[PDB]
Amino acid sequence: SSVLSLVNFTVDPQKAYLDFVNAGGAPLTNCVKMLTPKTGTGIAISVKPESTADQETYGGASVCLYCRAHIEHPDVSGVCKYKGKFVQIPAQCVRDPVGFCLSNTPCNVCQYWIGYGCNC
């Protein structure tokens, strides 16, 4: 709730969140972690949970900074890339799913996280 109100006093919410947690600020809590058979494909964003054994799946709206802070999405299409879908996060980054998402991008050809699945 501190960091949520902070990202409303700035023109660059992504940087404001990332600077906050990189400086020791508490990550946003209450991301909606799902229970899943860890038997999925491992892609970044999916219509159903796809965590592998090395990932956790979250409800997409809950790990979207723009959804959580009720601020305008940066997508020119106006449509959130996560809301209504599921987001896979490496299991070693579950301390800050929102920060992981702000910090990383799915590969444009294979849809796995660049650096965390994308073999291209």
Binding site: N30, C31, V32, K33, M34, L35, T36, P37, T39, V47, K48, P49, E56, G59, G60, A61, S62, C64, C67, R68, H70, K83, G84, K85, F86, V94
Partner: protein, 290 residues
């Protein structure tokens, strides 16, 4: 302890046929909690177990299935139950959710405000309610409640497809005579208590396959008394063991057909199909805030 591996307990006909006064509910394990599988909200487990029990019921599951989820928000501003519904339902299901307070969710349409402001223009296929009014904690005698139940009863009577189903949260003190009576208009009904929240008088009142006519004449005040008698008589252990194997969690893609029929045309065959979860009757053509 086979029951600990089931998703929860369903009220048996042994208790539905009783005739007793309404008593105070006294659970031996009251308010105990179980830790959750991970950094995982308790409502994840509760909703998953409700879904697991609904997997054993004859739900109609059409294409473009119409699902409305009332009481979906939380004091954390998120909606764990809605995300479970998204994980469970077909990918082409439409989820509309609603709460008095602002939240964000994975529904297709999210409406804020009293459920009475939710205008259901077309009939729906599945209603989930987790609504509960804080004032219900200020307990004289335990009488039937109005609250949001007046709205839900009217919804069942007007805005629910034939063959559609409902799961409506109740508790010892949060309950409605009229809603119990309306369970007699479904092909089958029960109260289902999750193992994840077995230490609470919470149950989900389940109406499976709406027929629009009275199949069972239920005395609703007496039936709540029977529900409390059942809970007072039935050891239930807190458990989430049913969630260890999720390979078959997702709702079966039944492809249930949707037909439009006039009431004069609804005959024995159609009633049989509706009662077996094999048919919905409604338009096949709008949920907004009024």
């Amino acid at each position: 302890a086979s029951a600990d591996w089931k998703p929860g307990h369903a009220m048996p006909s042994l208790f539905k046929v009783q005739n007793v006064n309404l008593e105070r509910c006294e659970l031996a394990n009251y308010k105990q909690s179980i830790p959750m599988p991970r950094g995982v909200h308790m409502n994840i487990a509760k909703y998953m177990q409700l879904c697991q029990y609904l997997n054993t019921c004859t739900l109609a599951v059409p294409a473009n299935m119409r699902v409305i989820h009332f009481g979906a928000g939380s004091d954390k501003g998120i909606a764990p139950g809605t995300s479970v519904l998204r994980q469970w339902l077909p990918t082409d299901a439409i989820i509309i959710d609603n709460d008095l307070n602002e939240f964000v969710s994975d529904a297709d349409i999210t409406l804020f405000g009293d459920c009475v402001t939710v205008r259901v223009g077309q009939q729906v296929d599945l209603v989930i309610s987790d609504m509960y009014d804080p004032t219900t904690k200020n307990v004289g005698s335990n009488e039937s409640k109005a609250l949001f139940f007046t709205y839900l009863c009217n919804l069942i009577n007007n805005n629910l497809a034939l063959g559609g189903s409902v799961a409506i949260k109740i508790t010892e003190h949060s309950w409605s005579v009229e809603l119990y009576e309306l369970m007699g208009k479904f092909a089958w009904w029960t109260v289902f208590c999750t193992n994840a929240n077995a230490s609470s008088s919470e149950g989900f009142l389940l109406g499976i396959n709406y027929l629009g006519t009275i199949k069972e004449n239920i005395d609703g005040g007496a039936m709540h008394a029977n529900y409390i008698f059942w809970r007072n008589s039935t050891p239930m252990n807190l458990s989430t063991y049913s969630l260890f194997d999720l390979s078959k969690f997702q709702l079966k893609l039944k492809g249930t057909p949707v037909l439009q029929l006039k009431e004069s045309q609804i005959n024995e065959l159609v009633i049989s199909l509706l009662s077996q979860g094999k048919l919905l009757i409604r338009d096949n053509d709008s949920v907004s805030t009024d």
